[PDB]
Amino acid sequence: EKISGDDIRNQNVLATMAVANVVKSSLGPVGLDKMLVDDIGDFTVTNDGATILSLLDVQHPAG
Amino acid sequence: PQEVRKANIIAARSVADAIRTSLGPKGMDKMIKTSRGEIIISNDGHTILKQMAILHPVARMLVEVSAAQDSEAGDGTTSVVILTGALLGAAERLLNKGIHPTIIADSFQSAAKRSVDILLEMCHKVSLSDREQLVRAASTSLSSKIVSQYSSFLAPLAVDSVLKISDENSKNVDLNDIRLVKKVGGTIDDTEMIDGVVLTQTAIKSAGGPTRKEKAKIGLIQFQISPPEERAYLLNICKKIKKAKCNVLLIQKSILRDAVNDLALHFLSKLNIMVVKDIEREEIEFLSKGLGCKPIADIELFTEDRLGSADLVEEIDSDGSKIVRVTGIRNNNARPTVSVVIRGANNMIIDETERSLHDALCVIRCLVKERGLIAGGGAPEIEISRRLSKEARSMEGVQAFIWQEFASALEVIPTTLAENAGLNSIKVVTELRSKHENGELNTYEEHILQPVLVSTSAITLASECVKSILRIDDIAFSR
Amino acid sequence: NARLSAFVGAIAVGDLVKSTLGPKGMDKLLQSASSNTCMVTNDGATILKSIPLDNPAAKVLVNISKVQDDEVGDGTTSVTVLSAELLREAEKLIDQSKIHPQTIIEGYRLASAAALDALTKAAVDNSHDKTMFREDLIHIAKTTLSSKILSQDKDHFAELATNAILRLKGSTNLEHIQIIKILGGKLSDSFLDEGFILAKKFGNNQPKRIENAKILIAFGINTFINRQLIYDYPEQLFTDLGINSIEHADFEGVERLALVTGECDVIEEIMLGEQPFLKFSGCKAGEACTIVLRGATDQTLDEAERSLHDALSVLSQTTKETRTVLGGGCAEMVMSKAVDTEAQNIDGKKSLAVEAFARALRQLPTILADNAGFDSSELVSKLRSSIYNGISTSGLDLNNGTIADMRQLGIVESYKLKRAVVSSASEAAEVLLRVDNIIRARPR
Amino acid sequence: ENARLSAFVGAIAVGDLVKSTLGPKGMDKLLQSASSNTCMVTNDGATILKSIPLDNPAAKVLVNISKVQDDEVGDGTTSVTVLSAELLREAEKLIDQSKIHPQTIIEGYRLASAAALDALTKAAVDNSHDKTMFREDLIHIAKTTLSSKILSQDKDHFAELATNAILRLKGSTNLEHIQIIKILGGKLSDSFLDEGFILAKKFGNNQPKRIENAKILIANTTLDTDKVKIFGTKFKVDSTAKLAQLEKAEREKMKNKIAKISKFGINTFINRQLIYDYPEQLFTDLGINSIEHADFEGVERLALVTGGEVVSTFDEPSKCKLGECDVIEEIMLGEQPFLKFSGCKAGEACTIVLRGATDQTLDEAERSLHDALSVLSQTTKETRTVLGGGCAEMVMSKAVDTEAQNIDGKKSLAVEAFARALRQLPTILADNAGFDSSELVSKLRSSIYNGISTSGLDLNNGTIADMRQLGIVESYKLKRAVVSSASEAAEVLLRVDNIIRARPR
Amino acid sequence: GLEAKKSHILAARSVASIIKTSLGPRGLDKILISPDGEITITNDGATILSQMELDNEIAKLLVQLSKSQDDEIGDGTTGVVVLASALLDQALELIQKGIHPIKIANGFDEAAKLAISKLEETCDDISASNDELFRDFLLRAAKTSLGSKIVSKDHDRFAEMAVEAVINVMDKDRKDVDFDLIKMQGRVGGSISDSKLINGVILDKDFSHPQMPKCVLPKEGSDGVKLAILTCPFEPPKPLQTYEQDKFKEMIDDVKKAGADVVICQWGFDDEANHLLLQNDLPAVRWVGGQELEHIAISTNGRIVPRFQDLSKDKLGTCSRIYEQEFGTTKDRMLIIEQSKETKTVTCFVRGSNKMIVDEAERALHDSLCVVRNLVKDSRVVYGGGAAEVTMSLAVSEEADKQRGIDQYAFRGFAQALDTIPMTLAENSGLDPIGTLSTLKSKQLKEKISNIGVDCLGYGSNDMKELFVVDPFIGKKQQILLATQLCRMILKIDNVIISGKD
């Protein structure tokens, strides 16, 4: 499949917006943490935003 | 039968319009995700069309045109696709007027030949004897590459390399005879021409290897030193080589068996016979040309007449490099070649440095076939349309209307250059045609120059491409 | 059901090669399931053999095209198109024209004799002034090299094929001319050599130049030739005895040596295209020539091979038959007049069958004007008015677009080539007109 | 494309309805209504076409065209529709294989129709033999028309003048070849007949009264008092004399046209308006005779009998079609000056000079004479027949093939296809009669092609036989009426590129 | 702003593509069907466009302009619409390139003004060549429009009718021909050779009672013929036979004192009213339309008399005579009212053997009368038939390189749009439009500058200057102005708003 024009441009912005809106809650020390669930069903609890993006599974070239 | 051609033109126009956004350094990059999961990002038109896996049969011809574009001129792989689609887009209104594609195809070949003489009259005449313009041409072309200050010393090395193989009437010269060996370590400031030959690998690192020999013979040998008592079998192998006094052994790299046994290293150490193993298959044809030798499959085929001559064969000491060089091949039948060693600390340096030297050697080679250069930036595309305006009135018949549409398709290239730069498309083009009454080719003070062969081959290849596109009136399945 | 499938199925065969006829024709592209085997070529024999067809009536024209390719090698497209035009008009002759199918067969038989008589009265040959006959071979060679990439340098290639045939003076067999294709250089660099260039060397290490050599195919011989390979020890023993051994001699090479020599004055070894060659000199009444073509790529050479072999096959037949006719749509126009001439006295049921053959003769030049970018109905009708009553000289011009003489433009055709096309195409059409039903046995 | 398809396939489908009904042996058709109990069977072609409702807007045009044949003549209406439908079958093959505007092809039909009418004339015969019996019947019918008319005073003198005004024509029967002169102060019995074309109001003053070997030229110009209305145009002049000088400069340019008159080799010029003395004085030195008050009617009637043409402009010198008359005599009768022309090349005409006692007797004598000459001349084109049985249909086919020799490039197929439609008539007649159309027509064309062919279609024996021995003839008036109607029928349909769908009722 | 610019070009192109094949004398006809069930066939674009009823907002501008073209020119029906569509097709390519639409509108306005000055140098004079050559243009003016019809046989008779009619109704001062001053009337039956030119209104009448004379006597050398115009009906006074008869004797005295020969009224008459008018030799005329009374006072130099008491001898219309002349075999037996003096109005009398021939002859005469007005208003003329459009193309294209800026491309697109007409005439003539266009441009440059057009109808050769084919310059100038005026209004409206049907 091949998609060009402004249709793929808006999808790239909404894709990065969806990824950004997830990590906006962990910004700053007063921010809120999150749980990352895998296919096994386990999870983890951490407030560090650096370890979240490494363990977060997102399929997208800009992601 | 028009439904087959109209379906192929529209399908090819969408491909040309997609690559059109990639023209120029500021152009839009196209992304291709392979089925295996690999994603590549670049503005190169030859890379996009190759990894796109186009199922359309006629659209696959753009890959062959872009291949010959880089092989002959070396530049304009994106521009030749835009010019090809510009003629296809203009041919849509030609078929609506009831014009048969034969007249359309025959007029493009006649217009491409006349466009060459127009560019030659407006081009600046230069010669290879003047090294002032030859150094500045390759130095400004490297401003788009990581090399900046070190690019000043790389320009004269590429000029003197071409002038030896260019001669006068030789015209086209094979670029495969120029080998660029990249290796980790060292720096860019350290360069050696080594006109004799340069290999791609190191020498024996084991104990007993001399790694250096003076006044030795070099030849291609496809044999391999391996066990089948074992020292007696390896003694006759080394004895037959001593009969022809061959002190340099080159063994083709193969994963089947090893190269030289450790027991044979002690035998060749007393005879002072240097061995270089792991010779790639690509270098087999290369070493058979510059050295003037012949590949030898068996031990009986090995003769003294097929062996060359080498002044001094030594392994240069360098950090993480250890490059072996050979000088003074002393072969009258085989012509000399240029092999330049590329060094650098980072792996990303020696990689792009090799590709940067490719575009520098092509532009210089463009002057070998046809001397002279035309300033880029849309100047040659507009100048041709200015001459074809008054010439179109001198024609008669159906072809008279083709000359007007041919000059209109040439304006697509300078229009795209203005779009990808953020400037207004039409406004910039009108400012160039307004000053055309005074200035002609004037970009000269900006040190931006382009060879004439790129603009000439782009029109010639696009004229034959579109000519062959309209020749297919049917698509059938034949297995 | 069978007649509808045989008539339409055969027209679809002619619709594939309809663009490959004439020098202004176009190339057809084919694609298999692997998609990497696609090749662009205008060869009519390649298109018919590569494309599979489930129509049993269409397979008849495939085998007939193979017979036409063996005699000459060109004009195979014109035979298929002419056979398809007879079947396209036969559909109107059966349904709405109230004509018996055998009457259509007998109509083409009486019309074929009128077409052959028109070519005989229009055949003019010049025995005196061999220089004028040499120019006729030049013009015929230009029409054979047409439709092929060689048309660029064909102006230089015109004297290459013409002077080559003049060096034979003997049997029409083509085994005298050996084609060697070497990469590199422009096509215009090809030359004509009578020295029998050989693509294989002799011996491991042996002297290149040999004087007063005696060729012996397998004694006091200076040259030895063997069909199989040579063992190591005698190869060294032959050098000490002064006997040079040749290896890798196939069945085709032995037949070419039997037509030349034995003994030879000088054997010289030259280096061209990075490979040892052997140019013989001082043979005994050598009738053999060697043409070495220099192409850019392997694809250019592969198309040039059969292009030159088909051009020399037609020029070889011009030695036995010196009569020539005017082509470029003029040959089919003259035969169209003889069909309508014999139509004055004809039966009732045979009238429309023979008159349909006259319009079929004008369908071949109609397609020639289609691929040329011109208007067929406009240009052919203007020529038909001039050929109608007397003064028949000029013919269709595919370049300027006006009515010009074919003799002034240098467009002529051989008489032996046209009589073979009218014959084979007529016999090919009679077979398909007879079959009203097809029954296939149950395969295993 | 559907516009031509509705004008062709839609018309052929309607044309094929009455196509099988051509001839006495043709097929028949049932016409069914909604209630189905009101239906009827008939072989009439005009009845089937008008009774069947047709929503095709192109088919409604063919109905109005067929009504012209019924009002003009009323015979052979079916043959007109069948022949017009066959022209569409050939025109459809010319268009689809071309897709060019048919108006160019229409020009080829006009050139082919002219050769078809000429072939029918050379082979035409007539029943006019033994004219002595026809002349005695012509004078008796003429006296019958004179009843209730003031001309009944003397029947013998007036019927004799009309008798010599018809049989002596040997050509077109149009009233434009008969000039009527009406004067006052005379008796009806004193009328005489003159073969010359007679004018009144003699031309010129000093011009001679006799002209030998006169040439006739037709032109329209004003050489006397140009610039009729000068009111409203701004006049800036220093003196009044410059206004009259401007008219002299405008008439000075007419000298070049006067010089072209002398270059024509003519001794006489004809003009509708007047001529000033100065351009008339130059006519004397150049030997030019100036005729005035020629009007229009008298010009057209004179140009046809003298073999000339009429034109109001001069396109180029030494190119024109001129008439001539040997002797021009100027006489005076009835206290009015008259003109007399004689010695015209191939001149066929007559002039009847009637002398009445008032204007009422003159107008009633001319109108009653035209009604009597129309009935008598109607028998000239009546009963005249030609060789039938498909012969004349094939004679027109081979005549078009003669035109196919010298022809343009684009008009070669347009004219040749017209001969194919002419050969479709014996094809239809052979199918309706139950015979083989491919065998008979092919053998019929081969014999008639070159020479000595009297053969025709014989439906009794089912073969080709001589029609002159069987006595099969068809009227010549029917031949020209059908071809002229079919030629005009094809023009109406082809000249329409797009056809808007009619309002359904 | 998005789909509007693309839809307006395709909507106007499909409508204009209908009449592209009907342009020129060789242009093919069409079959039109009225809503009443009548089928009409004509080549005139005004008839085809006026009968179109459509809700498309873009195509309605073609009908609004075509109404004003018939009065001003009448020949700009098909030519302007095809030329207007050419400017829209060239503007579509500019919109895709980013050109502003108003710049396209202003670009065509400046390009049209430059092309007019170029033709002003190359135009030729008629009256300066000769006086009689001007009349030869009027005689051959109607021949071109009537050459494609059966009327072309009698065309020589209709040529003289248009020459004398325009001179009377038009004065050389204003040089204006009013359509309301030309009464177009025709009937079915007869032939086309009986058509006569009348200097005044016809006003067909049966003369009431048959005893009344068919001719008007001079009444002892009286001046002209006095007629009475009454806008009020003739009735006895009301809020018996002898009562109404005595009241009629008082109202008839106004006719006897004024000396009116014929009485004309808008309403019918009684039976006893014609009895008193019979013995006094006063023919009665009843059932006269309101518009017919306007043509009476203009031709006879009369006035409108509102009531019976305002009747005077100075307001009576004066004419030469009134007689009843039988026309052909028609039993209507119409009448002729002559003048013998130059009037301000005329009435065209056209007959034909078919109902379609009458309608086609009246419309062809309408365009012929307008050409005479343009030849008198402007003596300078140019040679049309494809020669004018090619000359305008080479003039604008040559000046395009001299004018820099954005207008440089506006002049190139305007020059290419002018090539549509000669190519359309080449397509409508059955010839190669591109091959012919290159021929006309080659003869006007390498040889010499002249006028050579495309031949729609078969002629001897090219160079219509030899055949004296002339077209009015101001007539062609009015066409290119309405084309640019229409092209702007299409581009000046980017919005489409339409409601539903309740």
Short mmCIF file of N, CA and C in Angstrom, two decimals, chain B residues 389-468:
data_model
loop_
_atom_site.label_atom_id
_atom_site.label_comp_id
_atom_site.label_asym_id
_atom_site.label_seq_id
_atom_site.Cartn_x
_atom_site.Cartn_y
_atom_site.Cartn_z
N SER B 389 11.25 28.50 -28.60
CA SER B 389 10.05 29.32 -28.77
C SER B 389 9.96 29.85 -30.20
N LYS B 390 11.04 30.44 -30.70
CA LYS B 390 11.06 30.95 -32.07
C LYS B 390 11.26 29.84 -33.10
N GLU B 391 11.87 28.72 -32.71
CA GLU B 391 12.07 27.62 -33.64
C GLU B 391 10.78 26.85 -33.90
N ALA B 392 9.85 26.85 -32.94
CA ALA B 392 8.59 26.14 -33.14
C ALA B 392 7.75 26.77 -34.25
N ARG B 393 7.90 28.07 -34.48
CA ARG B 393 7.17 28.73 -35.56
C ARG B 393 7.72 28.36 -36.93
N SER B 394 8.96 27.88 -37.01
CA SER B 394 9.57 27.51 -38.28
C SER B 394 9.20 26.11 -38.73
N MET B 395 8.54 25.32 -37.89
CA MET B 395 8.16 23.96 -38.25
C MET B 395 6.82 23.97 -38.98
N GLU B 396 6.38 22.78 -39.39
CA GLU B 396 5.13 22.64 -40.11
C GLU B 396 4.53 21.27 -39.81
N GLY B 397 3.20 21.21 -39.74
CA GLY B 397 2.51 19.96 -39.52
C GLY B 397 2.27 19.62 -38.07
N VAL B 398 2.14 18.33 -37.77
CA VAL B 398 1.85 17.90 -36.41
C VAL B 398 3.04 18.17 -35.49
N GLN B 399 4.26 18.06 -36.01
CA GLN B 399 5.45 18.26 -35.18
C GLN B 399 5.57 19.69 -34.65
N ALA B 400 4.94 20.66 -35.33
CA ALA B 400 5.05 22.05 -34.89
C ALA B 400 4.47 22.24 -33.49
N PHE B 401 3.38 21.53 -33.18
CA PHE B 401 2.79 21.62 -31.85
C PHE B 401 3.59 20.85 -30.80
N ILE B 402 4.40 19.88 -31.22
CA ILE B 402 5.17 19.09 -30.27
C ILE B 402 6.31 19.92 -29.69
N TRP B 403 6.92 20.79 -30.50
CA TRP B 403 8.01 21.62 -30.01
C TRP B 403 7.55 22.56 -28.91
N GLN B 404 6.30 23.01 -28.96
CA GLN B 404 5.78 23.88 -27.90
C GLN B 404 5.55 23.10 -26.61
N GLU B 405 5.03 21.87 -26.72
CA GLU B 405 4.81 21.05 -25.54
C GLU B 405 6.10 20.48 -24.99
N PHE B 406 7.11 20.30 -25.84
CA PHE B 406 8.40 19.79 -25.37
C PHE B 406 9.10 20.82 -24.49
N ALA B 407 9.03 22.10 -24.87
CA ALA B 407 9.63 23.15 -24.05
C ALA B 407 8.84 23.37 -22.77
N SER B 408 7.53 23.09 -22.79
CA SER B 408 6.73 23.24 -21.58
C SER B 408 7.05 22.17 -20.55
N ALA B 409 7.37 20.96 -21.00
CA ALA B 409 7.75 19.89 -20.08
C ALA B 409 9.12 20.13 -19.46
N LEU B 410 9.99 20.89 -20.13
CA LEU B 410 11.30 21.19 -19.57
C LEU B 410 11.23 22.15 -18.40
N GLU B 411 10.15 22.92 -18.28
CA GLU B 411 9.99 23.87 -17.19
C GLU B 411 9.63 23.20 -15.87
N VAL B 412 9.38 21.89 -15.87
CA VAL B 412 9.02 21.20 -14.63
C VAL B 412 10.21 21.11 -13.69
N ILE B 413 11.41 20.91 -14.24
CA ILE B 413 12.62 20.76 -13.44
C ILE B 413 12.94 22.05 -12.68
N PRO B 414 13.00 23.22 -13.33
CA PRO B 414 13.25 24.44 -12.55
C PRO B 414 12.10 24.82 -11.63
N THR B 415 10.88 24.40 -11.95
CA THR B 415 9.75 24.68 -11.07
C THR B 415 9.85 23.88 -9.78
N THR B 416 10.26 22.62 -9.87
CA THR B 416 10.41 21.79 -8.68
C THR B 416 11.52 22.31 -7.78
N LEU B 417 12.60 22.83 -8.38
CA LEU B 417 13.69 23.40 -7.58
C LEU B 417 13.22 24.58 -6.75
N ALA B 418 12.28 25.37 -7.28
CA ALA B 418 11.75 26.50 -6.52
C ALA B 418 10.76 26.05 -5.46
N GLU B 419 10.03 24.96 -5.71
CA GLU B 419 9.05 24.48 -4.73
C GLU B 419 9.75 23.86 -3.52
N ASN B 420 10.73 22.99 -3.76
CA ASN B 420 11.42 22.32 -2.66
C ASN B 420 12.23 23.28 -1.81
N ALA B 421 12.52 24.48 -2.31
CA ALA B 421 13.25 25.49 -1.55
C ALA B 421 12.34 26.41 -0.76
N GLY B 422 11.02 26.20 -0.81
CA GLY B 422 10.08 27.04 -0.11
C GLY B 422 9.66 28.30 -0.84
N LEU B 423 10.40 28.71 -1.86
CA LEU B 423 10.05 29.90 -2.62
C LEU B 423 8.85 29.63 -3.52
N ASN B 424 8.20 30.71 -3.94
CA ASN B 424 7.05 30.60 -4.84
C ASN B 424 7.49 30.00 -6.17
N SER B 425 6.75 28.99 -6.63
CA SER B 425 7.07 28.28 -7.86
C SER B 425 7.12 29.22 -9.06
N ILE B 426 5.98 29.81 -9.42
CA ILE B 426 5.90 30.61 -10.63
C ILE B 426 6.71 31.89 -10.50
N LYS B 427 6.73 32.49 -9.30
CA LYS B 427 7.38 33.79 -9.13
C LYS B 427 8.87 33.72 -9.41
N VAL B 428 9.53 32.65 -8.96
CA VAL B 428 10.97 32.52 -9.18
C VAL B 428 11.26 32.25 -10.65
N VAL B 429 10.41 31.46 -11.31
CA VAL B 429 10.64 31.14 -12.72
C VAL B 429 10.48 32.38 -13.58
N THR B 430 9.51 33.24 -13.25
CA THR B 430 9.33 34.48 -14.01
C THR B 430 10.50 35.43 -13.84
N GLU B 431 11.13 35.44 -12.66
CA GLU B 431 12.28 36.31 -12.45
C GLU B 431 13.49 35.84 -13.25
N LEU B 432 13.59 34.54 -13.52
CA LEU B 432 14.69 34.02 -14.32
C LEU B 432 14.50 34.33 -15.80
N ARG B 433 13.26 34.22 -16.29
CA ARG B 433 12.99 34.55 -17.69
C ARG B 433 12.97 36.05 -17.94
N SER B 434 12.73 36.86 -16.90
CA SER B 434 12.74 38.31 -17.08
C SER B 434 14.15 38.82 -17.33
N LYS B 435 15.12 38.34 -16.56
CA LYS B 435 16.51 38.73 -16.73
C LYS B 435 17.18 38.03 -17.91
N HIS B 436 16.50 37.08 -18.55
CA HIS B 436 17.08 36.36 -19.68
C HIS B 436 17.40 37.28 -20.85
N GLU B 437 16.75 38.45 -20.93
CA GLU B 437 17.05 39.38 -22.01
C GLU B 437 18.44 39.98 -21.86
N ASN B 438 18.95 40.07 -20.63
CA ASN B 438 20.29 40.58 -20.39
C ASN B 438 21.25 39.43 -20.10
N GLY B 439 21.12 38.82 -18.92
CA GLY B 439 21.94 37.67 -18.59
C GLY B 439 21.53 36.43 -19.36
N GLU B 440 22.45 35.46 -19.41
CA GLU B 440 22.20 34.24 -20.15
C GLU B 440 22.28 33.02 -19.24
N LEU B 441 23.50 32.61 -18.88
CA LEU B 441 23.69 31.48 -17.98
C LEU B 441 23.69 31.89 -16.51
N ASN B 442 23.82 33.18 -16.22
CA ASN B 442 23.86 33.65 -14.84
C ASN B 442 22.45 33.72 -14.25
N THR B 443 24.66 32.26 -10.32
CA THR B 443 25.03 30.93 -9.85
C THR B 443 26.52 30.68 -10.03
N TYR B 444 27.16 31.49 -10.87
CA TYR B 444 28.60 31.35 -11.09
C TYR B 444 29.39 31.84 -9.90
N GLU B 445 28.94 32.92 -9.26
CA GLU B 445 29.63 33.45 -8.09
C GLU B 445 29.37 32.63 -6.83
N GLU B 446 28.37 31.76 -6.85
CA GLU B 446 28.06 30.90 -5.72
C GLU B 446 28.86 29.60 -5.72
N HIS B 447 29.75 29.42 -6.70
CA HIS B 447 30.59 28.22 -6.80
C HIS B 447 29.75 26.96 -6.94
N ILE B 448 28.65 27.06 -7.67
CA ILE B 448 27.77 25.93 -7.97
C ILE B 448 27.85 25.68 -9.47
N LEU B 449 28.44 24.56 -9.85
CA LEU B 449 28.63 24.21 -11.25
C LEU B 449 28.16 22.79 -11.51
N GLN B 450 27.79 22.52 -12.76
CA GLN B 450 27.29 21.22 -13.17
C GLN B 450 27.91 20.86 -14.52
N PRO B 451 28.27 19.60 -14.72
CA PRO B 451 28.82 19.19 -16.02
C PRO B 451 27.75 19.09 -17.09
N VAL B 452 28.20 19.18 -18.34
CA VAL B 452 27.27 19.17 -19.46
C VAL B 452 26.73 17.77 -19.74
N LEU B 453 27.49 16.73 -19.38
CA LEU B 453 27.05 15.36 -19.67
C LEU B 453 25.82 14.98 -18.87
N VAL B 454 25.66 15.53 -17.66
CA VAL B 454 24.48 15.22 -16.86
C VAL B 454 23.23 15.77 -17.53
N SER B 455 23.27 17.02 -17.98
CA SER B 455 22.12 17.60 -18.66
C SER B 455 21.90 16.98 -20.03
N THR B 456 22.96 16.50 -20.67
CA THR B 456 22.83 15.87 -21.98
C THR B 456 22.26 14.46 -21.87
N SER B 457 22.78 13.67 -20.92
CA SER B 457 22.30 12.30 -20.77
C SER B 457 20.89 12.25 -20.20
N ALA B 458 20.52 13.23 -19.37
CA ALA B 458 19.18 13.25 -18.80
C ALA B 458 18.13 13.43 -19.89
N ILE B 459 18.43 14.23 -20.91
CA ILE B 459 17.49 14.43 -22.01
C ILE B 459 17.50 13.23 -22.94
N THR B 460 18.68 12.64 -23.17
CA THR B 460 18.78 11.51 -24.09
C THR B 460 18.10 10.27 -23.52
N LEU B 461 18.35 9.97 -22.24
CA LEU B 461 17.75 8.79 -21.63
C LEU B 461 16.24 8.95 -21.48
N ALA B 462 15.77 10.15 -21.14
CA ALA B 462 14.34 10.37 -21.00
C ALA B 462 13.64 10.35 -22.35
N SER B 463 14.33 10.75 -23.42
CA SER B 463 13.73 10.72 -24.75
C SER B 463 13.53 9.29 -25.23
N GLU B 464 14.50 8.41 -24.96
CA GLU B 464 14.37 7.01 -25.36
C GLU B 464 13.44 6.24 -24.43
N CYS B 465 13.44 6.58 -23.14
CA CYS B 465 12.51 5.95 -22.20
C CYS B 465 11.07 6.14 -22.64
N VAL B 466 10.61 7.39 -22.70
CA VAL B 466 9.25 7.69 -23.14
C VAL B 466 8.98 7.12 -24.52
N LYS B 467 10.00 7.08 -25.39
CA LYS B 467 9.83 6.48 -26.70
C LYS B 467 9.48 5.00 -26.59
N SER B 468 10.14 4.28 -25.68
CA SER B 468 9.86 2.86 -25.50
C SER B 468 8.58 2.61 -24.71
#
